[PDB]
Amino acid sequence: KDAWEIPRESLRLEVKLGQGCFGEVWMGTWNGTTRVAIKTLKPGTMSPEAFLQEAQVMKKLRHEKLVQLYAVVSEEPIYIVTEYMSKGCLLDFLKGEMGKYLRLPQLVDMAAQIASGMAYVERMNYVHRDLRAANILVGENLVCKVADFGLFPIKWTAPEAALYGRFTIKSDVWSFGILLTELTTKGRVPYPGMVNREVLDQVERGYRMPCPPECPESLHDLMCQCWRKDPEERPTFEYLQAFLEDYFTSTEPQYQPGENL
Numbered sequence: 001k002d003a004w005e006i007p008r009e010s011l012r013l014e015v016k017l018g019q020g021c022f023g024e025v026w027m028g029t030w031n032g033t034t035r036v037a038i039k040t041l042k043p044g045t046m047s048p049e050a051f052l053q054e055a056q057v058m059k060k061l062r063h064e065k066l067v068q069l070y071a072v073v074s075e076e077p078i079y080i081v082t083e084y085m086s087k088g089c090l091l092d093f094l095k096g097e098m099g100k101y102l103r104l105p106q107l108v109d110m111a112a113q114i115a116s117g118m119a120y121v122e123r124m125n126y127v128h129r130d131l132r133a134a135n136i137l138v139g140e141n142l143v144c145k146v147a148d149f150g151l152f153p154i155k156w157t158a159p160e161a162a163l164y165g166r167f168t169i170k171s172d173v174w175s176f177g178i179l180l181t182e183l184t185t186k187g188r189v190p191y192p193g194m195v196n197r198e199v200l201d202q203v204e205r206g207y208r209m210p211c212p213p214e215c216p217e218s219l220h221d222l223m224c225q226c227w228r229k230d231p232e233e234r235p236t237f238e239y240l241q242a243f244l245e246d247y248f249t250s251t252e253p254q255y256q257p258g259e260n261l
C-alpha cells in the first residue's frame with residue numbers, strides 16, 4: 001500500500017545469485033530495462049513482517065554510498081528489490097581477478113567511500129554491527145556502497161561488543177580498522193594463524209595486527225587509532241573520511257607504487 005510497490009510482471013529473474021537460507025537472491029530486470037537485485041522469501045520460513053523489516057530500514061537510510069532499495073513486492077511470495085552492483089562483494093573482488101591490479105591509490109578511495117557511507121550512518125545514529133568487506137557491494141568504476149547480506153564475526157568485532165554486547169558506532173569504527181587490513185592484504189582473513197578464542201584473549205592483552213607488507217606506516221597508524229581499547233578514543237567516520245580523501249596530498253605526498261600496493 002506504499003509507493004514502493006510494484007507489479008510482479010515488471011520483474012524478470014535471470015541469474016541465481018545465491019541461495020541464502022530464508023529464500024534466494026537473484027540478478028534480474030525491473031520494467032525490462034534496469035539491472036536489479038531481487039531478494040526472495042521462502043514462505044513460512046520467516047515472519048513476512050520480519051523479512052520486511054530489512055526493506056523498512058533501507059527506506060529510512062538513504063545515501064549515495066549505501067545500498068539502495070528500488071521497490072518491494074510485499075504480499076507473499078515477497079520480493080525485495082535493490083540496485084544491482086556489477087562487481088558484487090568487495091571481499092570476492094579483492095581476492096579474485098581484479099585482486100592483483102588494485103594498488104594503494106584504489107584501495108584508499110574504496111575506504112574513503114565506505115567511511116563516507118559510514119558517516120551517513122554516524123549522522124543518523126544508526127549502528128551497522130557487521131561492517132566488513134563481505135558486506136560492501138562494489139559497482140562500476142570502483143564504486144563502493146555499504147550493504148548487509150544478513151550473512152560469528154568475532155575477528156572484526158570490537159571487544160566491548162564481542163564481550164558485553166556494547167555495539168556502537170565506535171565498535172563499527174573498530175571493524176572499519178579491520179576492514180582496512182582486508183583492503184591492504186587484498187582480502188586475507190585478519191589474524192592469520194589465530195582462532196576465535198585466541199583473538200579474543202590476545203586482543204584484550206593489547207595485541208594488534210602489525211603493518212601489512214608494503215602498507216605505509218601512516219595508514220597502519222590510522223588502523224591503530226580505530227583499535228584503541230577505549231571506544232571513545234576511536235575517531236569518527238567524519239575524521240576517517242576526510243583523512244582518506246586527503247591521504248595522498250596530506251599524509252603520503254611522497255607515495256611510490258610498489259609490487260602489490
Ligand SMILES: Cc1cccc(-n2nc(C(C)(C)C)cc2NC(=O)Nc2ccc(Nc3ncnc4ccc(N)cc34)cc2)c1
Nearest residue numbers: 017037053054057061067083084085088146147148149150
Ligand atoms: C538483513 C538486513 C536486515 C535489515 C537491514 C539490512 N540492511 N541494512 C542495510 C544498511 C544498514 C546498510 C542500510 C542494508 C541492508 N540490506 C542489504 O544490504 N541487503 C542486501 C541485498 C542484496 C544483496 N545482494 C546483492 N545486491 C546487489 N548486488 C549484488 C550483486 C551480486 C551479489 N552476489 C549480490 C548482490 C546484498 C545486501 C539487512
